[PDB]
């Protein structure tokens, strides 16, 4: 047989997307978490959120987006679910529009702007002493990108509204745009930007979506513990 | 110790640079050649030229040759481990980094595609002729061939201009060196990354058949001497000794 091999950091955002796509497709994959609990400077994984790789026979693929595209285009046995509609399908141009819009969110900026200036976060799951340690980019820049997020989240909420006409974001099937949405939100919850953008009083369809995928078997099996700082 | 793991294609240009740097620094590395003798269409390595390797070192994943080579030079710093780049503050650094960029910017991919297509522009190519034969419309494809040939010529004239500079630099090194004694490499006495880029480039042009155009029979004699000298270098032979022999899988 031909082995499928993945070298990744368990807590890297992009790696989470890749590993969830692997479970959503029911692929056997030999996964190697190369990260270490404590660094040489004695730091745990939630301190070091500063690219994964897939080896499949003769192919080497790098960066999550490229690994996911490789997976979608390569495993086409009928039993293997598709997470993307046919390239000439009516549905592709919409799905790919949200997928690009979600895959474009500055997660790097969010995580760095959560440790710094934690005032903008609410119920952040990162210990408070990271803020002190990391203070040895600016609030102006950070507020902006947070407001941009609202605008993006506004689009998701409005598009999510269409519920009975249960479905997922773009249709009946769980698609690649759902791994981007699911993993994005779970990270925002870790950073403390969840209460700011949904919950009681705000975006009820989005609050229902987030809670629904926490109950999903594949998501739970793959990302159930990634926000638990007690686990290496 | 912490393992060095390398996934690569033996015959890819970028894998060749990385593997040679590993051997020049005398690093232990678990190397995995992912390539297959025969493809799904039952084709050998010399049929299938079109490759980005990855290095796993502890917690680091590094992809692409230049980035892997920059990673090696910067992290492996034991006193017994050779450096292939002079200290950033050396007289020599700007000269080395300047040729390093000049060589690492050559479109090797376009040279190999333009060899499989349009072999009439190659001489004594080592790729079989039968690789080419396999690889309102009438006037559309005619215009593509014309544009691709114009491009291929252009980049081959650029190669010559790169090789003219190398030849002149090797002339400076020959004038500085007594003919009895240890001959320098491109930028000085030490073998540097720019020498691994140059060696692997020249070996590859030889394979594609773009050597006789650029050296031999009086043209670029220092470069010719350089090429023949690096074929005898121990690490080069150990690592690349057989990468141009289509009889070996």
Numbering used by the authors:
A (entry chain B): 23 to 72, 77 to 162, 200 to 228, 236 to 302
B (entry chain A): 23 to 72, 76 to 160, 189 to 302
Give the published text.
The ganglioside-induced differentiation-associated protein 1 (GDAP1) is an integral MOM protein, proposed to have an auxiliary role in mitochondrial fission and fusion, possibly via redox-dependent interactions with cytoskeletal components. GDAP1 has two GST-like domains, followed by a transmembrane helix, which anchors the protein into the MOM. Structural data have shown a covalently bound dimer interface in GDAP1, and while dimerisation is a common feature in catalytic GSTs, the GDAP1 dimer is formed differently, with a unique interface having a central disulphide bridge between Cys88 from each subunit. We carried out structural and biophysical analyses on several CMT-linked GDAP1 protein variants and describe new crystal structures of the autosomal recessive R120Q and the autosomal dominant A247V and R282H GDAP1 variants.
The A247V mutation site resides near the N terminus of helix α7, tightly surrounded by helix α3 and the α6-α7 loop, and having van der Waals contacts to Val121, Tyr124, Cys240, and Thr245. Comparing to the wild-type protein, changes in the crystal structure are small, but an overall movement of surrounding protein segments is caused by the presence of Val in this position, due to the increased volume of the side chain. Both helices α3 and α6 move slightly away, without altering hydrogen-bonding patterns. Ala247 on helix α7 is a central residue of the GDAP1 hydrophobic core. As the most dramatic example, the mutation A247V inside the folded core decreased the stability by 13°C, indicating the importance of a correctly packed hydrophobic core for GDAP1 stability. Ala247 is one of the most conserved residues in the GST superfamily, indicating a role in the GST fold. In GDAP1, Ala247 is so snugly packed that even the addition of two methyl groups in the A247V variant causes protein instability and disease, despite only minor effects in the crystal state. A247V is an example of a mutation introduced into the hydrophobic core that may have long-range effects on the entire protein structure stability. One of the residues in GDAP1 highlighted by the KL divergence analysis, Tyr124, closely interacts with Ala247, indicating a GDAP1-specific arrangement at this site. For Ala247, a mutation into Val is predicted to be slightly stabilising, indicating that such a replacement, in a tightly confined pocket and with potential long-range effects, is difficult for the prediction algorithm.
